[PDB]
Amino acid sequence: ARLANKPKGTIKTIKGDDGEVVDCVDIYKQPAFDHPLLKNHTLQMQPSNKLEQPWHKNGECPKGSIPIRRQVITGLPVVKKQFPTNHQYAVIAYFYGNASLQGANATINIWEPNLKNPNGDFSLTQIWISAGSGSSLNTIEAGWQVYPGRTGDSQPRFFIYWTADGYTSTGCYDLTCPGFVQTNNYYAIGMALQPSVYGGQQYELNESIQRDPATGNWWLYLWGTVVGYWPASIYNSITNGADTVEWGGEIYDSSGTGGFHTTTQMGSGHFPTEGYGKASYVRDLQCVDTYGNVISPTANSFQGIAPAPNCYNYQFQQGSSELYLFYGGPGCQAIA
Ligand SMILES: *[C@@H]1O[C@H](CO[C@@H]2O[C@@H](C)[C@@H](O)[C@@H](O)[C@@H]2O)[C@@H](O[C@@H]2O[C@H](CO)[C@@H](O)[C@H](O)[C@H]2NC(C)=O)[C@H](O)[C@H]1NC(C)=O
Ligand SMILES: *[C@@H]1O[C@H](CO)[C@@H](O[C@@H]2O[C@H](CO)[C@@H](O)[C@H](O)[C@H]2NC(C)=O)[C@H](O)[C@H]1NC(C)=O
């Protein structure tokens, strides 16, 4: 309903034609530098960059600044993020034996799933890169999400997330708290993504996360272009690498049926057996080992997490060049 106040270090504000607002914040005054553990202010400019968005038609951020989406305060609650009672999933997990994976990729099919209860529900698809357990669980997250209560509308939007204590008191979405350090001058996090058409054009969100071996910083690449990094200094268990990578969909059922009796959609809202063009997928299911080798785990190497298979589930499909994970569904019809 209302826009949040402009952040500190805002050099210029660009208003999009559709009501989006972008604050060009001085790269040295971005929220990340307000983190107590980020006293070590040295900004890694590049790992040891144009991405187009519709708001560029109204202006561009000057050099030395980054575009930050202005938050929309809806007045509705934003529930705690949760690693895979009212959350439901169709996710695959790759468990490494130690916290030494140096990166992971995910090419996620974009859709606009429908929400039965738009004021409280959400539906997302993402990667989870983690290390540790319980109070020490650290995560690196990126994907798309439909969450009107948080974002202001029902469009799939690019999001990032992180935690350093299993979501107890650290972490947040995008640049809403000190954590992630954005380096890209053109791409604002939190904007709408183009959804695919049923039986037609398919759109993908390619994301690559790579740990810099010299610094421990986890860099984010979208379609091969640097966006920024999650600093090593904000973490503890994942500073040397990750022990787990998970891919797939998730829904939040604010109706309280545990995700067992809601028609809130996951992926495209169609079950994985409908296939390419109809069901949503994740491809480029790869991670990087300790020695820099890219590994592509086979379908049998993953553990499936689909606690409501009659509502949302997953299915592997061997493509001609790589493995596909189809996932999602329409949910289950509520009882009358
Ligand atoms: C660190 O872990 C790697 C990988 O762990 C294995 O593979 C995972 C996918 C999962 O199934 C784990 O439970 C496995 O233990 C270890 O790499 C293995 O190393 C052995 C030789 O020691 C080799 O024969 C295997 O092929 C390797 N597996 C893979 C997948 O790379 C590695 O040894 C562990 N490091 C230490 C110091 O323990
Ligand atoms: C999959 O992950 C790998 C490993 O992080 C990415 O590989 C890097 O790709 C860039 C661009 O091609 C190269 O310059 C680097 O040398 C690669 N590193 C390694 C260790 O191979 C790869 O780009 C990712 N692919 C996708 C589609 O995200």
Numbering used by the authors: 29 to 76, 86 to 121, 132 to 380, 401 to 403
The authors write:
Neprosin from the pitcher plant is a reported prolyl endopeptidase. Here, we produce recombinant neprosin and its mutants, and find that full-length neprosin is a zymogen, which is self-activated at gastric pH by the release of an all-β pro-domain via a pH-switch mechanism featuring a lysine plug. The catalytic domain is an atypical 7+8-stranded β-sandwich with an extended active-site cleft containing an unprecedented pair of catalytic glutamates. Neprosin efficiently degrades both gliadin and the 33-mer in vitro under gastric conditions and is reversibly inactivated at pH > 5.
